C-alpha cells in the first residue's frame, strides 16, 4: 500500500520529435511519487502502448522552454523519444513550468 | 504584468501581538516586468481599493512552517513578518513549489 496526490494538471498539444507528425491533446499532470517520499513524478496520461500511461520520476526527466506556448521534455530512455508540447495559453504553460522547475528542487 | 498564480489564505501581522486578526487574502506570483524570467510576490490589500504590497520575490524569506502554515518576512519598513493559514494541504502545497520554482 502506497500515495500519489495530483499537484496540477495542464494540457497541451503532444507530438514526438522523432516523428518529424500529428499532434494530439494530452493532461499533463505532477504528482507525488507514491514510491519516493519528498519527490514528485510527471505522467502524460493515455499516450504509452495500450493507451497507458507515460509515467516518470521527475528527476529522470529534462524539461525546457523554447517559447511563451512551446516546451519540450526529454523523457529517459525506454520512451517515446524528445516531446514537444504546444500550449493553448501562455499562463497555463508558465504557471506549469514554474511547477515544474520547483517540483525539482 | 501577467498573474502565474493567485492563492487565499488568512494573513495575519505577527508584529502586532497575538490579538491582530487574520483576513483571509489573496496573494500572488507576477511577471516582473523589469526582470524577464523572474518574479514578484504581491500581498492584494485587505479590502478592494486597497494598495497591494508587492516585492521582488528573492527580497523576501518564505519559509514553511506546516502543511497548511508558511510565514512571509518581507524586507523591513512594510507589514512585518505575517503568517499564513490556508484552507487546506494542497493548495498551500501547490503554492509552496510554485514559490521555490519562481524564486532564483
Redesign the interface.
Known amino acids: 500500500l502506497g500515495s500519489a ?1 495530483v ?2 494538471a495542464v494540457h497541451a498539444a503532444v507530438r514526438p520529435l522523432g516523428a518529424g507528425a500529428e499532434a494530439q491533446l494530452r493532461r499533463l499532470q505532477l504528482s507525488a511519487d507514491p514510491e519516493r517520499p519528498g519527490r514528485f513524478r510527471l505522467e502524460l496520461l493515455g499516450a504509452g502502448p495500450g493507451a497507458v500511461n507515460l509515467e516518470w520520476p521527475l528527476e529522470s526527466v529534462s524539461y525546457t522552454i523554447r517559447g511563451p506556448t512551446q516546451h519540450e521534455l526529454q523523457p529517459p530512455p525506454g520512451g517515446p523519444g524528445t516531446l514537444s508540447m504546444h500550449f493553448l495559453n501562455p ?1 497555463e504553460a ?2 506549469w ?9
Open positions: 496526490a499537484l496540477m499562463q508558465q504557471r513550468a514554474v511547477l515544474v522547475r520547483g517540483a525539482t528542487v
